[PDB]
């Protein structure tokens, strides 16, 4: 509200977190504290907007950060010297000796690629590979291979979403995740004529979906029933799936 005033502020280019879209943020900094964020302009990816969660990481930053390494005696949780904690970790590793097919590292939510490269490289250097993600029993392949990158991600352009004739969404609530993707959805839906249907979760999103069940059998029914006509008939359709 009144914390700063924009000439004190080392306005700094950065990349968003807390959304997979990598939005176009710019950080207002007073030098130690982070004051606020401003969505910079980036015409492909989320041209003018921020996810509303991403606007208030500032109050989520300077509140309870880990400032020092902490070790447990056990239900008694004291901070300690850096080198002490490092030698404790190495000594505990030498105690357990988890040589083969063990030491389960796991991809956290909000990290950088370079830390994950160090993670994978250190685990494979240590002797095994066990790196999974946060997901509730995704201790298994994501059922689309790491081969052929195009299979993996949102491989249509974000701008081309408003070039799509009719799309349908499955297993997701795109208001709940990537809200600026929802903004481009509504931008297209007011611009053009799009037949939109949700399949799966019951969602109130502001572009008139037609929900067609909460079951896989309802999904396969809706695919073979009438969207087999629509998506084949339509010109550049898209089909978006949740994580």
């Amino acid at each position: 509200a009144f914390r700063a005033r924009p000439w004190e502020l080392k306005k700094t280019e950065s990349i968003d977190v807390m959304d997979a879209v990598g939005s176009n943020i710019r950080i207002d900094s007073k030098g130690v504290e982070v004051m606020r964020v401003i969505p910079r302009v980036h015409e492909d990816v989320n041209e003018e907007w921020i996810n509303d969660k991403s606007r208030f990481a500032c109050d989520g930053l300077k509140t309870q950060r880990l400032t020092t390494p902490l070790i447990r005696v056990g239900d008694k949780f004291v901070n300690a010297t850096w080198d002490d904690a490092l030698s404790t970790i190495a000594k505990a590793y030498q105690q357990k000796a988890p040589k083969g097919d063990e030491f389960k590292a796991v991809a956290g939510a909000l990290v950088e690629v370079e830390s994950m490269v160090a993670l994978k490289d250190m685990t494979n250097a240590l002797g095994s590979e066990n790196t999974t993600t946060d997901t509730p029993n995704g201790n298994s392949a994501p059922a689309h291979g790491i081969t052929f990158r195009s299979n993996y991600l949102f491989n249509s352009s974000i701008a081309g979403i408003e070039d799509a004739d009719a799309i349908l969404l499955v297993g997701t609530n795109p208001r709940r995740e990537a809200a600026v993707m929802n903004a481009r959805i509504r931008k297209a839906w007011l611009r053009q004529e799009l037949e939109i249907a949700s399949v799966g979760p019951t969602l109130d999103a502001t572009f008139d979906v037609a929900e067609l069940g909460n079951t896989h059998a309802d999904l396969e029914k809706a695919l073979s029933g009438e969207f087999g006509e629509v998506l084949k008939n339509a010109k550049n359709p898209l089909i978006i799936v949740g994580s």
Partner: protein, 115 residues
């Protein structure tokens, strides 16, 4: 290349940033579009700590707050290699043409209506 008048060991150590200054989203107005900016990063241990007596922020970077204002990106980068330190350039991002009929206030058969 040896630096002639740069007494620091800046030229081997830091990453500098060539960037177009972004168009601010709060105000409309676009004077920051027409520069090019040189900025040293804070990728440091010095990196603006906190004081303990009054509580300013005494930095350790001898060149924390410094901005050139250049004219052209290639003139910027010819300077950047001429005085010779490691850079990274960053491409700006424009705003795309979209035809705006002010008359967008008309419909066929369609559910949603607006102001």
């Amino acid at each position: 290349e040896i630096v002639s008048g740069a007494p620091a060991e800046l030229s081997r150590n830091r990453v500098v940033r060539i960037y177009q200054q972004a168009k601010p989203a709060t105000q409309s107005g676009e004077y920051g579009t027409f520069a090019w900016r040189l900025d040293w990063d804070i990728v440091d241990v010095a990196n603006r700590w906190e004081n303990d007596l009054i509580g300013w922020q005494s930095s350790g970077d001898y060149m924390q707050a410094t901005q050139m204002k250049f004219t052209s990106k290639e003139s910027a980068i010819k300077f950047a290699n001429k005085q010779g330190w490691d850079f990274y350039i960053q491409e700006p991002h424009h705003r795309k043409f979209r035809v705006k009929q002010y008359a967008n206030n008309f419909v066929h058969s369609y559910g949603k209506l607006k102001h």
